[model samples]
Target chain A: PYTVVYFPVRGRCAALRMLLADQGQSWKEEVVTVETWQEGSLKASCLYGQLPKFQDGDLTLYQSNTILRHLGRTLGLYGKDQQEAALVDMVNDGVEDLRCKYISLIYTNYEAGKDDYVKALPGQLKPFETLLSQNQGGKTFIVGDQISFADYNLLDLLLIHEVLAPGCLDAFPLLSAYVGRLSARPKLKAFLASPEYVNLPINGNGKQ
Target chain B: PYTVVYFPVRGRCAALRMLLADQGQSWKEEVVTVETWQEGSLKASCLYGQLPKFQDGDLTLYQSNTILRHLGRTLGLYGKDQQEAALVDMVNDGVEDLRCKYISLIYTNYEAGKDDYVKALPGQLKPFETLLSQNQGGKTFIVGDQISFADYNLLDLLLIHEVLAPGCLDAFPLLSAYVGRLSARPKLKAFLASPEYVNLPINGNGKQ
Candidate 1:
């Protein structure tokens, strides 16, 4: 019954929330205040002073992707086998990189500066579009035929970018379509509707 | 039994190299060049498009911190006790964060127009300075009294950094002293003198 630590913003931690929702898992939220993170060792606990940490038993885990892949396996979302899990991890790792770019742009570009961040996004993201298309294998999810953390993470990352960068998904039509289709799924909707999730995007309502 | 596929520079694969060296483990060092990295899956394989990959059998693990901790546990560097291993992991995680900041400045600033990576280096790395200072506990190493991966990494990170960024260590007196002491150890010195450790940085020959 340990509480998960993160800010109110639906950033890297949202996928963890979605995974919990997907599995009907129960947990508490210790939503980290901006002041607390900026002022403490809880900040150092983060690999890069970023949010979305996991608190379970005596452990307080950081590194969003590492936490997610661990949860995916423990809660039965990554895959049942090593190879399946590895593939799932591979796709998630790809998405994590893309998400980092999006977050870097959102936090450092507009908030910090635009020169370097803007250039990398436009130049670097073209291949991500192609990666999504190649990995789909005509299936809905990135890994197995069904909805997994890979699918949820893919959808979640795309949503964040689209909200912040709006037209950024243009080069990747398949990726855009994948996000749309996956977001509309029943379990995802249930998670979105849960009280545990507060869908605020920096300066918006805590609702989807 | 497997060759580590990475750059000759110690930044990426050095921690693993230290671990392999500590184990007296034999493997090939397939020195990767910048040209090859740019054209190969080496870049794409990383979520962040980086290197320092460790290929043990079919499992090719990236994330130098993960590689160190994983091998530490595998080789009984943390003793047979589970909790002791966890403590080693926790310490490594702290080191990983420290390195995250260190790399962020070196690489990120080089890319950015800003040349003042100094301001970015936490004015408060003093605590980490203390960790390395007190880690010895009047013994010869960090983590445990013996030469654990932690000790090797602590020294190796400083050793390469000292050579790569001239005058970097003069700022941290404790780290400078620690690295000097560790590098002078007979076993570690012999490893540095070996042929397989080709292209070692300045002072790998003890003149450093």
Candidate 2:
């Protein structure tokens, strides 16, 4: 069993929650409220002064991506071979770089920059589309035929971008198909439709 | 052998260079110049319009941390156990977060943000110091007794911050000594003192 400590928002925990649900793993969420966070004690105690803190039994972990990769390691979601593993990390890192830009835009300058951000969105997204085209005709997971941690992160990245810009992915056929195929997985579909997912806003500040 | 293509600066490549040098791994650098970058062909061809593109044998990878973790995986510097590996990643992610802030200050808003960034440097660094104190009396590597990839990343983060704010680690005894201990390692010391490292500016934009 795993325990996750984070804001009630589905911000960083969404992919991990989806991953757990898809994998049939049981986990608990310890939501931190804004008032409690402002108290200064818990924030100070947090290693990096942030949330999405994860616990695996007695061992505590911080860093959201670290938690995802930890689950990948234990759940056999890393790739099947060394080369595939490197590719998996490459995809995850690329997703993270784009996600960072998305977060900064959403939180720091949504209204002022959203238009330009969406205009330049194609360039930001082209790499992943190209990646899909190169690998197995975009028929399998991001790395290999088997699912990997990159798939989950990339899946969440695509999902969020769609919500941000509804037609954003229509231009890229492989990515469009990939999202539909992955989200339709029975367990993941159930999780996506659950109140646990739909009730919370994507970000705590309600930006995106 | 590996090939790294990037700007002549030691910005994102510094830690990876240090890792390769410390590991006694031979690699080549394909330096991109301002004139060449201004021509825009190479930059345009780059997937995400970024530098520090790395080639390991036939496989090419972007994302600096991905390359670091790849080297860690192949070079046996990850960690002894699964738990330790996760901890190593946690440390690396935290280092990357602080490094990103440092980069933004140096390149994007140095004159306005440098003082403030350096002012809050201690808080940014406390997690690592705390990490060290909890493990092996701050004497050993970040995760285990043996060094991991996070050590290389953290080492570069500490080195650059000290240059940014002299004696910045003075308040954190363990981190201060940690920098000293890691820098003194034979191969790493030679690499740090070499002209390849000393002659290059820290940022591509000629800051730092």
Candidate 3:
């Protein structure tokens, strides 16, 4: 059995669950309260203090991208080449950049004295929309229109925006519809309806 | 022809340059000044706003780890087998984790007075020292006696110690001399002799 240790929120862990959902795999989701996280397996000597630590029986994995790749292999997704792997990371990291900027506004805006810490994401968002178009090379997905890690990552980011900024999705219709398309997958829809996935708000942790 | 854009400092660019040196490969090195970097090829609508972008013929590459892996493939470095390659990445990311912490100390801590930075390094230094022990493994190089990327990355972080905190190396004598040994490699020695590799005093980089 695989175990996921994250705070009660979806946060970083949601991507993994969503990926697992898309794969029809099952794993236990362990939501640690603030008290447990402050003094539990997190403080151990092995070093990484942040969570969404995924465990498959005895073997443990850290680093979200690494875990996502492992999940892709287990689920029979991603492509067979290094280029495939690179694109997977490129989109995943792309989503991270967007989320990070959101975090900055939530935390740093008032301190900079601009009265607005908001990241005008127009530049980042525009290139990404173009990339979604260009990297497609006229295909439906990032690689040969197949269900690769890159697409899942894109879907995850779109879901995040849907939740984080709501109508924010309407602004990027292609992306918003892409999210709708992925979340509509049979396995994914099943996973999203599960108690483990459905019973959580999707943001914030102690490190913020 | 390959081109590298980075500050003249031996920060992220050293290992890639070393691969070029060890392989006797031709490459163009741009020792970017601060002002030039702010407004040059590495800026917006560019390969990326990140320094250390590598332009290899028709392919453009980013990410320090990805560049190192590509160079390792071209230069006959990187681990030879699956297990060896995994070990190399494990050690490489570990060293990177430490280097990032050191960077955080300089900009995020010293500048912000956030915390005592080096106070935790001794504990951090132990794993590498353990790697150096002849009795434990007698490996000489990290991960089975070859001068792989793991060795190169370790060498890079050791150089960081020399630049950022002078006596900090004394606590880990094995790592200190390991730096000297890597620096003195026949090709590496010549690379170090080049003006770009010449060590410089700290720039008080306008931090008050």
Candidate 4:
């Protein structure tokens, strides 16, 4: 059994939610509203005073990547071995670095910085494309043949970037096809089509 | 054998270096100077165009946390079990979140933002104190009885914060003691005192 407590927006939980859905694992969502968070009680109780608090049996966790890695370990999605696991972490960290920049532009400086941000998007996205190209001729997952937790995170990132800058992946054939392949998995396809995901905004603010 | 490729400064490599030293592992450093980096060949070859590239025999890795987690796994510095491993990741992620904020203020806004950044230091640090308190009554490591890789990363964070804001940890006794204890590890103590560490500035811009 599992529970995720966070604001309604997919935000940081998108990848992990996608991981759970595609894995055919079910979890409960405890949505926190602005008013609920403003009360200070739940916020104070959090380890980092942030949301996306997770619970699995007696283990309570915070941090979206922590949750993803936990599920990756428990559910056999991390990687096949230590080397693959290290590569997975590398991919996830790169994804996270770009995600941080994307978050800053989206929440803080969208209107003022959108042009420059989009200008730099290609360079930021190139590393993932190179990573895919190096592994299995860009025909399979990000690391080894089997999907790792980082794949889900990277897929979510690529998906959102396409929304942020349409045709963002057109130049990177590997990443473009990787996105299509990952999105078409039966469970993930249905999950993406579901109302829960389709109804929510990609970000909290009305921005893309 | 291990080789670390990075700029002359400690920067992101501090924690992994500390981990290597404390664990009695030897590594060679291939320092890159600004002049060399400006030429751009090596930077172009880097997966993300960043430093702190790590080589473990034939395997090459980038991203500081990726290297740390890799060492954690290969060297048995990760937690003893799945639950503890997740907790280790959670602590590392929290440390990373604060480290990003510290980096932003240091490199981009030191002159204009130091006052506000220092003002918010306590609240920013309380989560770590609380995390320590929740585990083993703040007696042992950040997560479990034995030290995990996150301990090294968190220790580096707390040490740097002290330089950034003098007496920053005074209110958090647990973190204060944790820093002192981890810093005193025989190998780590020597490493910290060595010229390799003492000669370099904490950050590139001469900011703490």
Best by lDDT: 4
lDDT digits (tens) for residues B1-208 of candidate 3: 8898766566667777776785678898766777876675457644335666777677666666667766665566766654455456556767777866776666666755423555666777776777577423533677666778668778777776665556778987778777777778888889867776666322324221
lDDT of 4: 0.93
Considering the two chains of model 4, state its CAPRI-style docking category.
high
- Cα lDDT of all candidates, in order? 0.61, 0.90, 0.64, 0.93
**How much DockQ does model 3 earn?**
0.26
Please give, as one word, the docking class of candidate 2: high
> How do the residues A44-107 of candidate 3 rate in per-residue lDDT, one tens digit apiece?
5333456656776655665565566566655656555555554454555556566656655545
Mark the 10 consecutive residues where model 4 chain A has the least summed lDDT.
Answer: A197-206
lDDT of 4 by residue, A1-208 (tens): 9999999998899999999999999899999999999999999899888989999999999999999999999999888999999999999999998999999999999999999998999999998888888899899999999998999999999999999999999999999999999999999999999999999889989799
- For residues B1-208, could you state the per-residue lDDT of candidate 1 as single tens digits? 5567666555646666767775778888777776888786768765456665666677665556546655664565753343333334445555655665566555655445223544544343444465556656434555445556666666665665555456676777776676778766666667776765555533212222
Question: Number of the top candidate by DockQ?
Answer: 4
In model 4, pairs of residues that clash are none
Clashing pairs in 1: B203-B208
TM-score of 4: 0.98
- By DockQ, the better pick of 2 and 4 is 4
Query: Which pairs clash inside model 2?
Result: none
> What does the TM-score come to for chain B in model 4?
0.98
Q: A26-63 in candidate 1: lDDT tens per residue?
A: 88878777788778877775644556667667755656
Superposed by TM-score, candidate 1 places the C-alpha of residue A183 at a distance from the truth, in angstroms, of 3.6
- What's the lDDT for residue A108 in model 1? 52
